[PDB]
């Protein structure tokens, strides 16, 4: 078949939000949760990229130093 008329702006607008919700509920939300789980485990290290990549690490940084109690740095030795 072939379209008989042109689609209005309103319809498109509606469709936009429809699609956005559709995608968000099924892709993005799942991906976010999957991403966030990996934090507990050590970061991933690739052998191929060893030529340029930084050494491996386990420890995670703290993005919010304002709510970071306890010592931050150690005093230099004599």
């Amino acid at each position: 078949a072939v379209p008989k008329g042109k689609r209005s702006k309103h319809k498109c607008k509606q469709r936009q939000l429809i699609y956005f919700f559709d995608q968000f509920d099924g892709v993005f939300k799942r991906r976010r949760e999957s991403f966030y789980r990996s934090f507990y485990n050590p970061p991933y290290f690739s052998k191929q990229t060893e030529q340029t990549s930084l050494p491996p690490s386990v420890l995670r940084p703290f993005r919010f130093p304002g709510f970071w109690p306890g010592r931050f740095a150690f005093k230099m030795a004599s």
């Binding site: 995608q23 099924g26 991906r31 999957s34 789980r37 990996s38 485990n41 991933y44």
Partner: protein, 239 residues
């Protein structure tokens, strides 16, 4: 797509036991066969989660039929390997290993990450009770009994919880109604050990943790470092 079709179509649909693979059955079986040998030769492989959940089915059966030590079983084992190196390893390092392990010699670990080039899940298929394992394995056999006894002797709660179970294993003295004192009395010889048959040399080997060391130095990289080759070669474009 729409993300709704997936749900609409899936209603009243049964799950497949064996995951489909690209190619004819004859091809699929070949693929799985070769991957089993490659898994035997490495100790851990990095594969997609669906595939990792599929190869583990044959990974268990290979070791299950390798321990029988029968002409019949030997045939089936033969029918599942390609290279001699995998046969050698299976029959000389893995069979002695899982002497006391009833089953479950492998596991699957999810990486919770997506491929850069494919956006696909990833997982590790590693054997159990191997050097450099992701996580430690539980004891079996007399080791298990010793662990249990230790647990029991630790605290009261353990004693109470293991009371029933301990009876079967014989860790409770029926003549006094108390946990056995000496645990070494329950030691028995395993299959893995060597049965009894019944120097001032300068070339004597030196004891060391995996294998002994020679009293001489040989200029040779490790087995994994004496054979180099380009992983991939660029293919120039033809505009």
């Amino acid at each position: 797509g729409w993300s709704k079709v997936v749900n609409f179509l899936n209603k009243g649909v049964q799950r497949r036991p064996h995951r489909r693979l690209p190619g004819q059955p004859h091809h699929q079986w070949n693929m799985l066969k070769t991957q089993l040998d490659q898994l035997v030769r490495s100790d851990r492989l990095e594969l997609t989660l669906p595939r990792a959940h599929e190869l583990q089915q044959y990974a268990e059966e290979l070791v299950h039929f390798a321990k029988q030590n029968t002409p019949e079983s030997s045939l089936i084992v033969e029918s599942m390997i390609f290279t001699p190196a995998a046969r050698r390893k299976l029959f000389h390092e893995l069979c002695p290993l899982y002497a006391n392990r009833p089953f479950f010699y492998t596991r699957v670990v999810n990486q919770h990450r997506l491929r850069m080039r494919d956006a696909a899940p990833m997982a590790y298929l590693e054997f159990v009770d191997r050097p450099g394992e992701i996580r430690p394995a539980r004891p079996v056999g007399f080791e298990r009994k010793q662990a249990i006894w230790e647990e029991m002797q630790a605290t009261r709660r353990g004693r109470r919880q293991w009371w029933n179970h301990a009876k079967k294993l014989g860790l409770i003295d029926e003549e006094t109604g108390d946990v056995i004192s000496d645990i070494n009395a329950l030691r028995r010889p395993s299959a893995a050990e060597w049965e009894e048959s019944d120097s001032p040399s300068p070339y004597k080997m030196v004891a060391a943790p995996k294998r002994a060391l020679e009293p001489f130095f040989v200029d040779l990289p490790p087995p994994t470092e004496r054979y180099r080759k380009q992983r991939y070669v660029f293919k120039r474009f033809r505009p």
